[PDB]
Design a protein around this ligand. Structure first.
Ligand SMILES: O=C(O)c1cccnc1
Length: 319
C-alpha cells in the first residue's frame, strides 16, 4: 500500500478544494511597470517599487508554462505570513510582453560558500532551527518544498535572518499520490528519488535538510557528492551501507535498477563519528550526530518530522 506521511497526512483533504487545486487558481496580474529592475540579484533582479521607492526582488517567470506558474503562485499565497518563508508581495506582468513575474521581499544574502566557513556550533543550530520553522510550516500547510539546498536558503548573517526561497518545485502532498522523482537538486535528492519511488512525502525535505546539516557540521560541502543520479545513490550507500539500502528496498517493495548492480559495490554502514577530524571537531557533538542519524536514514517514513527535529536536544541552546 506504499507509504504515507506520519504527519499532516490528510490536511489538504480537510481544506477547501480551492486551497490545493492550483490549476483552478486565477492570479491577479498587476502592472510590472510599477517596478524599476535595477540590477541582477547577486533571472532575479533587485528592483525598486516606483511608488514608494521600496527595494524588492523581482523573479521573471517563464510565460509558456501556465501550470507551474499557477502552482508556484498558489503555494506562495497559501504560505504567506509563514515563518521564514520568503514573502510574495505581488504578482505582475510586463505590459508589453505579458510575461509574468513575481515580486518578493528583499533579503541581503551572504554567499553560503563563505558563510558556512565562519559559522559556529551555535550558529548552525540557530539557522537549522530557523529553517525547520519554515519546513514545519509549509508541511503543516500541506506543501513539500522539494528543493531544499543552501542556494535556496537565504541568510543575512548581519541581521540573523533566514528565508526559504524558490518554491517553483514545491507540490501539495496528498496521501498515495505519485510524484515526479526528477525534483530537488542532485546532492540533496533523498534515496527514494534515486530509486524511482514516487509515493514520497514531506520527509523528502527532511533528508535534504539533513544533507545540509551534515555539510555544515562536517565541512564537506556537498556531503554526498554524486557525479550523476546513479552515482549519487552510490555516494549515499558508501555511508549508509549497501545491505542497509537493500533492506530499505525490500521493505517498500522497490526493485533496484539493474544498472546499479555493477556500480553499487559492497559497503559497510559508517558510524557518523568517522567523519570527524581536526578541521570540524569544534562543530560536531554527540547531539549533532544523533540528530543527523535520525535525518539521513533510508527509510523516509522513519526520518524525524520537522517538528520532531525541533524537539531534539541539539536545538536546546536555541529554543
Ligand atoms: O526564487 C525565489 O523564490 C526567490 C529568489 C530570490 C529572492 N527571492 C525569492
Amino acid at each position: 500500500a506504499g507509504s504515507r506521511a506520519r504527519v499532516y497526512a490528510e490536511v489538504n483533504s480537510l481544506r477547501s478544494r480551492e486551497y490545493w487545486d492550483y490549476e483552478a487558481h486565477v492570479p491577479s496580474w498587476g502592472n510590472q511597470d510599477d517596478y524599476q529592475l535595477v540590477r541582477k540579484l547577486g533571472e532575479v533582479f533587485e528592483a525598486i517599487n516606483i511608488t514608494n521607492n521600496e527595494r524588492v526582488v523581482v523573479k521573471i517567470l517563464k510565460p509558456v508554462k501556465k501550470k507551474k506558474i499557477k502552482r508556484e503562485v498558489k503555494i506562495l499565497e497559501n504560505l504567506r505570513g509563514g515563518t521564514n518563508i520568503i514573502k510574495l508581495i505581488d504578482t505582475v506582468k510586463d505590459p508589453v510582453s505579458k510575461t509574468p513575474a513575481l515580486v518578493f521581499e528583499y533579503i541581503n544574502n551572504t554567499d553560503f560558500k563563505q558563510l558556512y566557513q565562519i559559522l559556529t556550533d551555535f550558529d548552525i543550530r540557530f539557522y537549522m532551527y530557523e529553517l525547520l520553522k519554515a519546513l514545519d510550516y509549509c508541511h503543516s500547510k500541506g506543501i513539500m518544498h522539494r528543493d531544499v539546498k543552501p542556494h535556496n536558503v537565504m541568510i543575512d548573517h548581519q541581521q540573523k535572518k533566514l528565508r526559504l526561497i524558490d518554491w517553483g518545485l514545491a507540490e501539495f502532498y496528498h496521501p498515495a499520490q505519485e510524484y515526479n522523482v526528477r525534483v530537488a537538486s542532485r546532492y540533496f535528492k533523498g534515496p527514494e528519488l534515486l530509486v524511482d519511488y514516487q509515493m514520497y512525502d514531506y520527509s523528502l525535505d527532511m533528508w535534504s535538510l539533513g544533507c545540509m546539516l551534515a555539510s555544515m557540521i562536517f565541512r564537506r560541502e556537498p556531503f554526498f557528492h554524486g557525479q550523476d543520479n546513479y552515482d549519487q545513490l552510490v555516494r549515499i550507500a558508501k555511508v549508509l551501507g549497501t545491505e542497509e539500502l537493500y533492506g530499505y528496498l525490500k521493505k517498500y517493495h522497490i526493485d533496484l535498477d539493474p544498472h546499479f548492480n555493477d556500480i553499487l559495490g559492497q559497503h559497510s554502514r559508517k558510524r557518523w563519528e568517522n567523519f570527524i577530524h581536526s578541521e570540524n571537531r569544534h562543530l560536531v557533538s554527540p547531539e549533532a550526530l544523533d540528530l543527523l542519524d535520525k535525518l539521513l536514514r533510508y527509510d523516509h517514513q522513519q526520518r524525524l518530522t520537522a517538528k520532531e527535529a525541533m524537539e531534539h536536544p541539539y536545538f536546546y541552546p536555541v529554543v
